[PDB]
Amino acid sequence: LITNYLEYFNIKQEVTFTLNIYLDKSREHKQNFEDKLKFALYSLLVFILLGGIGRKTSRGFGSLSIIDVKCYDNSICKKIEDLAKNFLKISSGNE
RNA sequence: AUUGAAAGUUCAAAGCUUAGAUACCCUGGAGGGAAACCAGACUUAACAC
């Protein structure tokens, strides 16, 4: 009971992680792979911008924030790289 | 009324004897127990005011 109670307080502030994304190229452009993938990368950006990880993300906990994005295949993601660079500096709320 | 008449190719007799469907021969080669999946959802009640 004490272990179960004390583990609950392992809450840290500012957990920082690196999310790598690998891609299987062997899975070809079957019908619409490239656009499906681009839409999925946009969905990932929208997740990083509007959602969080873990429990009760609907109440602010686990809120995510971008620190650095780096593309490695421009032809697929170079419109997500900059569009996420669009969040490394936010002067005011209206912006 | 004929170079005729008469005359059982018959009798006895084991397709038997010896003889190994045996000799050589890998159920082996190839093949990812993987694929997908949020430990998460939410506060409510009571009376006082």
Q: What are the distances in angstroms from CA A68 to CA A1, A11, A26, A88, A94?
A: 41, 24, 28, 8, 22
As a rounded value in angstroms, the CA-to-C1' distance for A94 and B33 is: 53
Q: Nearest nucleotide to A55 by CA–C1' distance?
A: B40
For this PDB entry, the determination method is cryo-EM
The number of beta carbons lying within 10 Å of the beta carbon of residue A28 is 8
As a rounded value in angstroms, the CA-to-C1' distance for A21 and B40 is: 24
Which letter, b or e, does each residue of A4-25 get, where b requires 16 or more Cβ atoms within 10 Å of its Cβ? eeeeeeeeeeeeeeeeeeeeee
Token readout for A17 is 């992680």
- In total, chain A counts a number of residues equal to 95
Is A64 in contact with A48 (CB distance < 8 Å)?
A: yes
As a rounded value in angstroms, the CA-to-C1' distance for A64 and B46 is: 38
Q: Which of A15, A33, A11, A10 is nearest to A23 (CA)?
A: A33
Q: What are the distances in angstroms from CA A4 to CA A8, A10, A17, A93?
A: 7, 11, 26, 40
